Amino acid sequence: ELGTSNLNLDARNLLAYKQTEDLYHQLLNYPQEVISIMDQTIKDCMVSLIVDNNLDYDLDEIETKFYKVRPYNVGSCKGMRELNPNDIDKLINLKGLVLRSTPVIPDMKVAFFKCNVCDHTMAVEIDRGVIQEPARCERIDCNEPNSMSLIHNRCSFADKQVIKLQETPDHSISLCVYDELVDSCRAGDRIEVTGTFRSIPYKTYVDVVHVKKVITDQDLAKIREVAAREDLYSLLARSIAPSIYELEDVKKGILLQLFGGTNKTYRGDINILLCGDPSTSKSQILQYVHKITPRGVYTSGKGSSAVGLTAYITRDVDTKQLVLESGALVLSDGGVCCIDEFDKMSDSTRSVLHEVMEQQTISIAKAGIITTLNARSSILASANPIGSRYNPNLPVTENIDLPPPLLS
Amino acid sequence: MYKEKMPDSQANLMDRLRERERRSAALLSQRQKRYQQFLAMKMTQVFDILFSLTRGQPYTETYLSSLIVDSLQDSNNPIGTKEASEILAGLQGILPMDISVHQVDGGLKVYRWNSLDKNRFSKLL
Amino acid sequence: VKKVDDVTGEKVREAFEQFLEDFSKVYRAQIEFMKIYDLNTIYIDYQHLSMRENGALAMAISEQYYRFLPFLQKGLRRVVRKYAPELLNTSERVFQISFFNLPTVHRIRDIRSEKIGSLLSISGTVTRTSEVRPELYKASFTCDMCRAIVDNVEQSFKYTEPTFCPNPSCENRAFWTLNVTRSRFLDWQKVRIQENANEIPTGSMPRTLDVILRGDSVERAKPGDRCKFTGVEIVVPDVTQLGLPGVKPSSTVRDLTYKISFLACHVISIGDQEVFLNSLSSDEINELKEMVKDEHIYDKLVRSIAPAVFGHEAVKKGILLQMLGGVHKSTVEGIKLRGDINICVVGDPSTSKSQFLKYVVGFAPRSVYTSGKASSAAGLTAAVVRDEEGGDYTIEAGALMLADNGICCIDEFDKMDISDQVAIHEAMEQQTISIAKAGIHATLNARTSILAAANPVGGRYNRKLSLRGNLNMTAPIMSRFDLFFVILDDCNEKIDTELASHIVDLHMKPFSAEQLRRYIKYARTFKP
Amino acid sequence: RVTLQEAPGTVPPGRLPRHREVILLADLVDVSKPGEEVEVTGIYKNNYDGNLNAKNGFPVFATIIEANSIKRSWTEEEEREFRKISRDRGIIDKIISSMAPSIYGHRDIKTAVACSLFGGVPKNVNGKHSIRGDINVLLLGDPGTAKSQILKYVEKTAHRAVFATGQGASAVGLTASVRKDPITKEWTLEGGALVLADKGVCLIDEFDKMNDQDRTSIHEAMEQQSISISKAGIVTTLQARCSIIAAANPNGGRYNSTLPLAQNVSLTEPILSRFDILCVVRDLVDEEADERLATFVVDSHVRSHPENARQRRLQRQRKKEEEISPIPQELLMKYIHYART
Ligand SMILES: Nc1ncnc2c1ncn2[C@@H]1O[C@H](COP(=O)(O)OP(=O)(O)O)[C@@H](O)[C@H]1O
Ligand SMILES: Nc1ncnc2c1ncn2[C@@H]1O[C@H](COP(=O)(O)OP(=O)(O)O)[C@@H](O)[C@H]1O
Ligand SMILES: Nc1ncnc2c1ncn2[C@@H]1O[C@H](COP(=O)(O)OP(=O)(O)O)[C@@H](O)[C@H]1O
Ligand SMILES: [Zn+2]
Ligand SMILES: [Zn+2]
């Protein structure tokens, strides 16, 4: 039924079935041959199901066009740094986060040669990256040698793009994409990669075959059992932090911050400040949260700056568009960040927190750069009281060294 | 100014408010019909965009609707995104023979329109 | 010896000549106008081209424009010889064609290799420009062995010497003498543009592109303008592709790199009652008329700015008036009178003052949002930066030069350093930006309406003192705001109950926002 | 090779100055020096052939002008009308009233503006001694006193005027900038705003709020009418024979009438000593003065609002000029030029 030019093959079915696992083990070294066969196989299957089965009649454009197939859930490998020189050109599976994209670069497919003495035209195509200039004009009369010339703007090209990805094996890798894969991956995308690991006479890069833009029932039973029992809140608070005794309200608050609110389009990024005495276990809680929560970034207000939190932003000669060196506050996008020494943060850095907490954005307008960046994250912060200890002889507002606009 | 100095009406002011009320819905319906005609006339200046430089079929409705806005319509008479979506949806209904877009999983994917002719079908308005 | 002929091209040329002869003969009147006024370039409406053969001729011309252009040029020059041969006279047949009024406008975002060699229209904000230069359109050469002459040597995108001496009695090749008198040249210019603000989603960086203009269309692009171009995409050689990963094809050794540029033939800048009214249809006129000819339209528009923010009607009136700034006047003495309106709002850290700025930047046709601490002096007015293609300096548009003839929004205004608040003053009162730095001595247009938000000196409104002591702004900057609001918060139960109800409904979920732009586009032209 | 730039008063609105390369050959050298205004006759030819055909996309060249003759002037019909005007009794008051007619009052400022426009005699006594011939004016006062829009009349009235803002100017930019020649690769100097305004007037708005170093760069120009520089081995002095008109705000933004002038401004006695006329303005309130000012301003805004046709519209414009000034303004410009000449 579909008019699409490709099928995303459910490659997890390859592991769910035995002969397909054997096919994967055989295929680990030869993906291109199987993909090329599957193109013709798809065309033949379409032709059969259309006319041989007499179920449809729209065939001409499908008959003439070329197809591809993209497996998207292949089993993962042993990791990027563990790949060996003979693991090059093998099918691989990787994961990470995308950072930068290069502009659309055309890549040659068809060469249009015209004879400069008789205007005759020849169609020449590239095989394995080779251009073959015709030696002589093919016409019977015009036999002038070396008269063929290439018209640059009558040729045919295809889109090629280089995308930067911070990879985490099961360091950054610069991928390559072709055809409709360009501009499907953009800055900040959460990406799993299925493709070919490459290094050619030697830089490491991945030829992407597909890209992914993204438990047991016994686990469900355990979750339901823990949820049903009446001591649910008590058990959660008791089990979150054994080294911190009691503090039921603090436990409930921080756990609620981990749960987070509902996001509607109005985020649910809950932020909590600890204003206890400077000897209560608060660093031990934040250091533990940095490890128990889905991975974020651990920072300190004293050891941070405005550039350190937001980003460093500059243009690029090659890319011809702005690029970012992501700071911790933006790196925490969608996660949790911990800020110790919140009372010691510099004023310029504190000014960033305003728009972050009010719109989850950071707008910058400086020399040659005017852009806005998203920093949707939850902030857990600790701040010692003014002086050596909290003094109830002064108002509660006066015991905290944060201005009213930030504290309120 | 103080123009309403002596409009010494009778208790007929209640009937005046009845006139205000009972026909206001008719005016609102006429305004809605005028917006419908507004869309049915702007679609006459839109399908040239589709006809000109789109022959492949990767274009979802989200792309074409965002291409009607920030386009030639970005002019003395700008148009809204939801208005552009309404235009693109009404094109299928007004031209059944060349557009048969169907819901895929989410949203709509638009294919290469057959385009027998350009504007002669506007007579149905 | 007969050369290969393009039969499709010949059919296209014949159809184009028939279109020129039969269309009504307004284009022949244009030819006569060019002859009268000594004009070089003819202009063709694309919707006129697309009304013959159901527009199939226009489609065929557009989709392979770089190929079919010579045939249309030949047809037009044959027509001009048929009717106005004096235009072939010099003191020799230079002639240009420029199409305009394309239906589709394509973004820098949507540039694809499929678009190469096809007619399309784009739009983008200009950032840098180069000076105009002459371009060698058609050259001629004289032989060196013998003294024969070769005319009509078209220089297609490269310096091209003749491949042979026409007389077989001479064996000259690879050596020629260039003529600089019988050869003819044309104007050249390159425009460096930026993707518009409403295109890029938040967290995405704008794309940049280089656009090529030639002929009389040059110099019609100015920095900071939302220009529009019409033409065809062409690839040009690139040297920065070296070092990239992946296999690179080779010719045999030679390199075959490329990068994409856009060549535009027609230039227009987006922007008097009857002129505007004649560009709208009857239904469009009626829709715009309903919003004008109703008794309560002013209150209706007041109660329509930023509908999410409850209350605060004074700021809603203020923004509505700021969006319809006063008429600019020039004195018979030449002194100019500023027409744009500035607004400053100060509120407690709880009252929603930032949502007005966000609504304005999301609604205004041209708008820029910025933060007080993030901004700097150079980033607002203009940046003095070394230019490409030379050793001299060139300006870059700051926050104020961008969104010229628009509304500029600044948040956390009181947080701004005074040394970079000062630079906003000249734009706020003189509507100009003056630069006397590093070889630049020009004065630039800064017709912008400044909208600012700020907080009291102690964060909270110290209601013990008066308005004089609660603000750190000095008199010179306060005097330049036509409107000035200080909104406060109070514990009134009847107010707080409704405020809570609506701010909770927000998290729970007359004239539409689209209609307001249509209304303003008509209203802004009046001069009371 | 010499670069000719558009005259400062002739730059079109909102565009950078245009300039061309002019080639001086056959003993036509040293005919002009930076800051001079010249008219030249030559040939419009193209000579930029070379790598430009491949470095920039597509084959292009660049244009130069090869100079043939150069020259660095009034008909009787103009002098006759000037002399007709000159014999009127009390001409000084008409001239003073002619400056910025749409600005009400401020006669003590208008007289200083007119005096600076006409200027004095640069008496180079016996050659060995010199005196500046131009009058320096400082406009200090509260906001809402047209200290800025007066400069937008001097810029449109004087033959050659340069306008700059306090924070939008640099010490290098105002005085002179260093360049490396694209042909000879040698250290070269390019004049700044003060060099451009030679035999003219230089305008500096918001003179108080500029940084101290840019303010210091104006010291030599205000008395020596010249720029002395020593950068990258270049040691030279350029002519900067221009008057300076400066507008500024007092400390705190409002003038304290109870405090002296030497306390109301961040400037210093040296800088004040380079001026001749100081115009202090108070925005004090009074019913009669405010009524006069408002009824003048509202009629000015009525006039400046829009509404052989060329001749008719020129006649109507001159009618409006007569309604507010005793002297036609084109005639005033020509008169000022003639008097200075
Ligand atoms: N309730 C507690 N449980 C466990 N350890 C505690 C507790 N209170 C204080 N401590 C100990 O006291 C030390 C001080 O830590 P903390 O008060 O969190 O930071 P700081 O030293 O900056 O005040 C820690 O090493 C911690 O182990
Ligand atoms: N009248 C109102 N209607 C809806 N929301 C409001 C209103 N007043 C305040 N708010 C809420 O309170 C918040 C105020 O933030 P704001 O004062 O703009 O921060 P900042 O002072 O840093 O700009 C907003 O996020 C807004 O959602
Ligand atoms: N004396 C005056 N007569 C008429 N109009 C005036 C006068 N003073 C100021 N104005 C008006 O007020 C504005 C002052 O602008 P500007 O010169 O920037 O003020 P300042 O420089 O004194 O702060 C001008 O547009 C002018 O129209
Ligand atoms: Zn041949
Ligand atoms: Zn020869």
From Swiss-Prot, chain A:
Changing K282A: Loss of MCM2-7 complex helicase activity. It is found in: Nucleus. Keywords: ATP-binding, Cell cycle, DNA replication, DNA-binding, Helicase, Hydrolase, Nucleotide-binding, Nucleus, Phosphoprotein. Residues 232-408 form the MCM domain. One of its GO terms (biological process) is DNA replication initiation. GO terms for cellular component: CMG complex; cytoplasm; DNA replication preinitiation complex; MCM complex; MCM core complex; nuclear pre-replicative complex; nuclear replication fork; nucleoplasm. GO terms for molecular function: ATP binding; ATP hydrolysis activity; DNA helicase activity; DNA replication origin binding; helicase activity; single-stranded DNA binding. Disulfide bonds: none annotated. ATP binds at G276, D277, P278, S279, T280, S281, K282, S283. Acts as a component of the MCM2-7 complex (MCM complex) which is the putative replicative helicase essential for 'once per cell cycle' DNA replication initiation and elongation in eukaryotic cells. The active ATPase sites in the MCM2-7 ring are formed through the interaction surfaces of two neighboring subunits such that a critical structure of a conserved arginine finger motif is provided in trans relative to the ATP-binding site of the Walker A box of the adjacent subunit. The six ATPase active sites, however, are likely to contribute differentially to the complex helicase activity. Belongs to the MCM family. This is DNA replication licensing factor MCM4. The chain holds residues 235 to 700 of 933 of the full protein.
Curated annotation (Swiss-Prot), chain B:
It is found in: Cytoplasm; Nucleus. Present with 2190 molecules/cell in log phase SD medium. Belongs to the Cdt1 family. DNA replication licensing factor, required for pre-replication complex assembly. Faithful duplication of the genetic material requires 'once per cell cycle' DNA replication initiation and elongation. Central to this control is the tightly regulated formation of prereplicative complexes (preRCs) at future origins of DNA replication. Required for the recruitment of the MCM2-7 helicase complex to the replication origins. Associates with the MCM2-7 complex. Interacts with MCM2, ORC1, ORC2 and ORC6. This is Cell division cycle protein CDT1. The gene is TAH11.
UniProtKB/Swiss-Prot annotation, chain C:
It is an enzyme of class 3 (hydrolase). The modification Phosphoserine is found at S204. The keyword Cytoplasm does not apply. One of its GO terms (cellular component) is nucleus. It catalyses: ATP + H2O = ADP + phosphate + H(+). A motif (Arginine finger) lies at residues 479-482. Keywords: ATP-binding, Cell cycle, DNA replication, DNA-binding, Helicase, Hydrolase, Nucleotide-binding, Nucleus, Phosphoprotein. Acts as a component of the MCM2-7 complex (MCM complex) which is the putative replicative helicase essential for 'once per cell cycle' DNA replication initiation and elongation in eukaryotic cells. The active ATPase sites in the MCM2-7 ring are formed through the interaction surfaces of two neighboring subunits such that a critical structure of a conserved arginine finger motif is provided in trans relative to the ATP-binding site of the Walker A box of the adjacent subunit. The six ATPase active sites, however, are likely to contribute differentially to the complex helicase activity. Belongs to the MCM family. This is DNA replication licensing factor MCM6. One of its GO terms (biological process) is double-strand break repair via break-induced replication. GO terms for molecular function: ATP binding; ATP hydrolysis activity; DNA replication origin binding; single-stranded DNA binding; single-stranded DNA helicase activity. Its EC number is 3.6.4.12. It comes from Saccharomyces cerevisiae (strain ATCC 204508 / S288c).
UniProtKB/Swiss-Prot annotation, chain D:
ATP binds at G141, D142, P143, G144, T145, A146, K147, S148. One of its GO terms (cellular component) is MCM complex. Its main location: nucleus. It comes from the Eukaryota. One of its GO terms (molecular function) is helicase activity. Changing E6K: In allele MCM2-1. Changing R274A: Loss of MCM2-7 complex helicase activity. A motif (Arginine finger) lies at residues 273-276. It is found in: Nucleus. Residues 91-298 form the MCM domain. Changing K147A: Reduces MCM2-7 complex helicase activity. Abolishes MCM2-7 complex helicase activity. Reduces MCM2-7 complex helicase activity. GO terms for biological process: DNA damage response; DNA replication; DNA strand elongation involved in DNA replication; double-strand break repair via break-induced replication; mitotic DNA replication initiation; pre-replicative complex assembly involved in nuclear cell cycle DNA replication; premeiotic DNA replication. Keywords: ATP-binding, Cell cycle, DNA replication, DNA-binding, Helicase, Hydrolase, Metal-binding, Nucleotide-binding, Nucleus, Phosphoprotein, Zinc, Zinc-finger. Present with 1690 molecules/cell in log phase SD medium. Belongs to the MCM family. Component of the MCM2-7 complex. The complex forms a toroidal hexameric ring with the proposed subunit order MCM2-MCM6-MCM4-MCM7-MCM3-MCM5; loaded onto DNA, forms a head-head double hexamer. This is DNA replication licensing factor MCM2. It comes from Saccharomyces cerevisiae (strain ATCC 204508 / S288c).
